[PDB]
Amino acid sequence: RLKWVRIWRR
């Protein structure tokens, strides 16, 4: 898993 990829935005 790696949800910390699509959430990023900055």
Tab-separated table of N, CA and C in Angstrom:
chain	number	residue	atom	x	y	z
A	1	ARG	N	0.827	-1.201	0.000
A	1	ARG	CA	0.000	0.000	0.000
A	1	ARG	C	0.866	1.257	0.000
A	2	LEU	N	0.246	2.396	-0.285
A	2	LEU	CA	0.959	3.669	-0.317
A	2	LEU	C	-0.002	4.825	-0.570
A	3	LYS	N	-0.982	4.978	0.314
A	3	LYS	CA	-1.966	6.047	0.190
A	3	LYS	C	-1.288	7.414	0.190
A	4	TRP	N	-0.089	7.474	0.759
A	4	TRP	CA	0.665	8.720	0.823
A	4	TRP	C	1.305	9.039	-0.523
A	5	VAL	N	0.476	9.164	-1.554
A	5	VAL	CA	0.962	9.468	-2.894
A	5	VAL	C	-0.087	10.226	-3.700
A	6	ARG	N	-1.340	9.801	-3.579
A	6	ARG	CA	-2.436	10.439	-4.297
A	6	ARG	C	-2.986	11.624	-3.508
A	7	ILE	N	-2.783	11.598	-2.195
A	7	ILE	CA	-3.258	12.671	-1.329
A	7	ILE	C	-2.383	13.913	-1.462
A	8	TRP	N	-1.076	13.701	-1.563
A	8	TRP	CA	-0.132	14.803	-1.697
A	8	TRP	C	-0.578	15.774	-2.785
A	9	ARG	N	-0.301	17.057	-2.577
A	9	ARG	CA	-0.676	18.086	-3.541
A	9	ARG	C	-0.162	19.454	-3.102
A	10	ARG	N	1.157	19.583	-3.009
A	10	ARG	CA	1.775	20.837	-2.599
A	10	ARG	C	3.295	20.705	-2.552
